[PDB]
Design a binder for these strands. Structure first.
Lengths: 683, 687
RNA sequence: GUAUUCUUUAAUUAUUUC
RNA sequence: GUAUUCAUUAUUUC
């Protein structure tokens, strides 16, 4: 409008937001003389809804904001969807005393509070709304009914409002019906929901899709029998389908739905999906058969769906069967099919399956692409068939395809399992000359080959090159990788770096840290950790609790470890673990305290737990220590007398202790290379 | 002697070259106790090396069965099943060789773990063709093989006889395997008879045994018989472990499960509660929880937090709050875990008031807030989008004497990311900088998203330049992901191709979000060539095209003025059997005609749309008018209007704007049309 | 301005608007 | 070496 005002507006929309108020002040008099409403509008067209906001708040604090000013911002805020801002204009009103608003605007604020769970404020506002003589509209009504619906237990107030609205001649719509039914749905008002819809009929009213889904939902968590039926034939399965997907989980039946559906594709596929995503594939395959059994001829896309849900259950045998019915019915498998048959969540016996998929994948033409081979490598990688992954890697290249980074990472996954790093290094080095530079994943997979290789070299060699941006994964992978190698420098090093970069560490790191102190020479940072893990608000684990006991055990303070064990007995959620029992027994044994140690073994059994090899092994050590070899020999009996099968270390610890005690023929009688240990000892 | 020195050589050598290295010190090897070298190489965990030598020696003819058996024990002990199936397949033994049973059974199990059953049976046949006597574990492995093939019950009954006829007595491993086999075929009756018959032999069953007998009933059948087993279980005195309740959980139904185990402890109750939780059936666990009380045992804070956590993931606010009150009313006073659990809730509607209602309890609970608690509260208020309250929580943090961390600044930017309020987002990151803090990646993602919802393209590019060069921010899948999106929302084609470039270059494997966006952006221009290449490349990737992929394709053809091809897909989606055309699908098709004309065709589509049920929207009609509004025709676009309010759908701003502009440019016959009923009637004035 | 399940470490003010 | 459901080639081995 005004050239002076256009300059002012441009000057406002260009100014940063944090400084703007100190700026608007400087132009106080300049602003007051103008039409803010016109500035707000101009600041809204230009796409700067947040600058008008600032202006409004400024003017309210000055007295130059009117209803129309506010009403303009609000309409902008709701179309833009900034409920928070709406709610704040209401909590810090830029309005002068009198001040009444347009209906549309009040209903936008009501929706904003609703959107925030401030149902109690919405109702306060609604009351204030009609005591100022504002005629609410259909949308205002529907918004308020929604407030009542999510606030809960407000059915009577809903009856009241429906009355009030009709008595003022505002007939309900579809947003009114669904809103209401979902309200009954959230309160278990099954009975009164139906009487409602069936009253909607009376007064006239065309039924709907969203309606039925709401009604559906009622009987859902609440009947889906004679009900869900109507919804169909009444008239289209859109969202209504999903409702079936959770209908099954909150209940339990396979006969009614078969008996129902019988009586009657997507619709079919929907119900099948409902079964296979909650883990009822046996239930879906039956739905599939029934479906086939009645005319219906599935296409490749229906098979890919069934195979897809069978796949998450690793039902190899029937996936191949389905693969059969396809190709022998015309339904030629597509790319999506093989990818589906190869994206199986790994189980035991996956290799031969994969092998059979590949056999039909190549006995049916289908030229394997580059990505196809990568998919086939990943598959044998899941199983762990290094042998078959690499045969695929070799067949690949030998056919002229060029391996990508996805192909190298695949192979790298494998070796990682087996901690074969000497082969990993070769992969990496190969990929570099080919031009391919390792990514983050490629590194984590290296860190894991090394750790299972006990190669600290390659570990610290990467630590260097990273300290390779250190991502939360890499730093977390490094903390672990060092713990397998039990490396305190490395672990600690990158521990604080995880904090200095604004990452929140999980119980894994904390647990891993606590123990690299317990079994080491630090026993206070440990206490720091168990105080940090808590101060952090995290819930300690048994493993955490067990690692804890090991600390006290190594600090020669065992009863305290016994306390934590006992305290676990009440935990009501924790519940010891022979490890916890073992760990405590190991400590007492380590301090010469062995009666106390078998006293906890007695509890152990009494509690109905189950002593094991390692458990007995501990005592034999602690007995051998203070040379009292008879009570020790009595133990190994117990193990075997109960068939617990001792360990050569159980024997060694006695042999080596029988040697040092000047008793040689004893070491001999009692009793491989061990006897040899006595010979090189005796003389 | 001289061996200890030679082992270290092989133990310290590049694996992919060890062959030619064993070829080197060959004659020192042939005179060395191979099996001896093997035993040594394993004593240091160098088992990959003991294999390579085996294969070497084998190729030289220097490996005997005693050696192979030695490598196999380790592999099995080191869990290397594929490697053993390899030895089976290549054969490093000379002709006429026979192996220990312990080894043979280690291979059988290895063949079993790869699904190579038909092969395991053939090896078993050989093993007993060499007059080797199988042991218990051998018989048991083979049983496990029979049980995973299917239709193998007679072979199980027959082998049971043999093994029992060789004086070999079944065990718990046997029982669980035979029962579990019957569970994998639906052999309910025989599993029972077998159990009955096995019991009657004096065999005391056990947990594992009872667990398989229960999977029978529960897998595909009944919850009443499986529950009965649960019955007979305790009656025997065998305590159901965690795996027990998992079977039931996966097998008014919660009222039953509690009636049986009634004729337990607090840990028991939690074990079954958590079972139903981890399955996804939580209303049941609640039901038990109602009983654990009205039955005696009183739950503590650990038990309650457990329950709250379950509710958390379902974000069942009101009940969570009820439960927090019953806690503090029945005596159970919350802890730092209780609160944190309460604020770790899943985003949703009305979450802001919940958090306020929780914080209201943290405060009254006279519990000093810590630096951590603030970070949580800021995060939750930031997660629901209560920008206002996050910042209030923020200033309250930095005023009680706590120091923000990066998470603290990240929470805050998360909110702004939803609002697009990048100006503040900037002002923050700098503050993060002026405090000795360096922005994370997510910090860069948030800021990125923050610029997107706004429209600030200069801050995006300012991120790309700092990402495509310096190391301040590494091109992480995430960061490149947040870029394809933030450039779409701002329609920066150039800046997406670069990202789709690097993604398909930095070793990444794009996702449907990325593909589709690329498809819609190319389609939003005439970019047919690339777009179709993207679509197929979705196919060549191995992903399933959703509706948005199909709608974007139709709009491309629309855009390319081939709207007939657009309907072929709508038809194709009509019989997709898996994908049902969407409202936006139909419109996209109609507009494509109306954009090039043939509105009588546009009517053709609308017709069936209604024929397929399908209830049209405003846009549906606003588009139909477009063609009828600007096609030397007005008597129709007026008749079409009477289908909106007369059908209570209510037109809109883009609509009428097409009526005046199109009519006031096709005059007077336009004036009377607009008179039939603000911001517009200045266009007419402008004309 | 409003409704029916998933979505809340979010493509869901995602793709259609002569 | 072998079995039951769906950081673990995790924490205890005088």
């Amino acid at each position: 409008l005004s050239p002076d005002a256009q300059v002012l507006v441009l000057a406002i929309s260009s100014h940063p937001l944090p400084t703007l108020a100190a700026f608007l002040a400087s132009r106080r008099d300049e602003l007051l003389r103008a039409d803010i409403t016109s500035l707000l509008k101009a600041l809204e067209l230009s796409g700067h809804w947040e600058w008008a906001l600032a202006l409004l708040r400024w003017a309210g604090k000055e007295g130059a904001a009117d209803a129309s000013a506010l009403e303009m911002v609000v309409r902008a805020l709701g179309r833009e969807g900034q409920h928070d801002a709406v709610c704040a204009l209401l909590d810090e009103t830029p309005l002068p005393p009198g001040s009444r608003l347009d209906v549309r605007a009040y209903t936008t604020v009501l929706h904003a509070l609703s959107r925030a769970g401030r149902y109690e404020r919405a109702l306060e506002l609604f009351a204030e709304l009609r005591r100022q003589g504002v005629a609410p509209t259909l949308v205002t009504y529907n918004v308020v009914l929604d407030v009542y619906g999510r606030m809960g237990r407000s059915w009577p107030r809903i009856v009241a409002l429906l009355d009030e609205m009709r008595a003022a001649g505002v007939e309900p719509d579809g947003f009114t019906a669904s809103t209401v039914i979902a309200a009954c749905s959230r309160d278990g008002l099954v009975d009164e929901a139906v009487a409602f819809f069936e009253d909607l009929k009376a007064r006239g009213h065309a039924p709907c899709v969203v309606t039925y889904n709401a009604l559906l939902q009622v009987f859902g968590k609440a009947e889906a029998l004679r009900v869900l039926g109507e919804m169909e034939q009444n008239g289209p399965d859109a969202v209504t389908y999903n409702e079936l997907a959770g209908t099954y989980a909150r209940a339990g039946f396979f006969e009614e739905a078969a008996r129902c559906l019988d009586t009657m594709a997507f619709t079919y596929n929907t119900v099948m999906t409902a079964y296979g995503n909650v883990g009822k594939v046996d239930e879906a395959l039956a739905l599939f058969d029934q479906m086939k059994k009645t005319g219906f001829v599935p296409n490749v896309n229906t098979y890919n769906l069934v195979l897809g849900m069978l796949g998450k259950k690793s039902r190899f045998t029937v996936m191949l069967e389905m693969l059969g019915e396809m190709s022998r019915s015309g339904c030629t498998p597509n790319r999506v099919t093989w990818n589906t048959m190869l994206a199986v969540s790994g189980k035991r016996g996956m290799e031969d399956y994969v092998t059979r998929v590949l056999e039909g994948m190549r006995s049916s033409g289908v030229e394997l692409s580059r990505d196809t081979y990568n998919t086939l490598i990943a598959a044998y990688g899941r199983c762990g068939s290094r042998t078959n992954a690499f045969k695929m890697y070799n067949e690949m290249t030998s056919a002229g395809f060029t391996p990508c980074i996805t192909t190298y990472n695949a192979l790298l996954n494998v070796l990682s399992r087996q901690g074969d790093w000497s082969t990993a290094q070769s992969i990496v080095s190969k990929m570099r000359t080919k031009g391919f530079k390792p990514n983050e994943q490629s590194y984590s997979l290296l860190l894991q080959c090394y750790a299972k290789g006990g190669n600290v070299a390659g570990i610290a060699a990467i630590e260097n090159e990273v300290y390779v941006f250190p991502s939360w994964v890499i730093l977390r992978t490094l903390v672990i990788a060092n713990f397998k190698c039990r490396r305190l420098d490395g672990m600690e090093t990158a521990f604080q770096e995880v904090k200095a970069r604004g990452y929140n560490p999980d119980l894994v790191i904390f647990n891993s840290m606590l123990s690299i102190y317990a079994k080491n020479g630090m026993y206070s940072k440990a206490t720091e950790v168990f105080d940090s893990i808590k101060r952090s608000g995290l819930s300690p684990d048994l493993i955490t609790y067990n690692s804890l006991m090991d600390m006290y055990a190594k600090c020669s303070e065992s009863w305290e470890a016994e306390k934590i064990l006992n305290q676990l007995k009440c935990s009501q959620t924790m519940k010891p673990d022979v490890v916890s029992y073992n760990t405590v027994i190991n400590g007492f044994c380590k301090q010469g305290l062995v009666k106390e140690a078998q006293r906890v073994l007695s509890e152990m059994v009494a509690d109905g737990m189950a002593p094991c090899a390692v458990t007995y092994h501990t005592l034999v050590g602690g007995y051998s220590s203070l040379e009292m070899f008879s009570e020790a020999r009595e133990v190994i009996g117990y193990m075997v007398q109960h068939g617990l099968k001792p360990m050569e270390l159980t024997y060694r610890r006695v042999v080596e202790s029988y040697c040092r005690a000047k008793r040689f023929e004893e070491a001999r009688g009692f009793l491989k290379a061990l006897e040899a240990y006595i010979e090189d000892a005796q003389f």
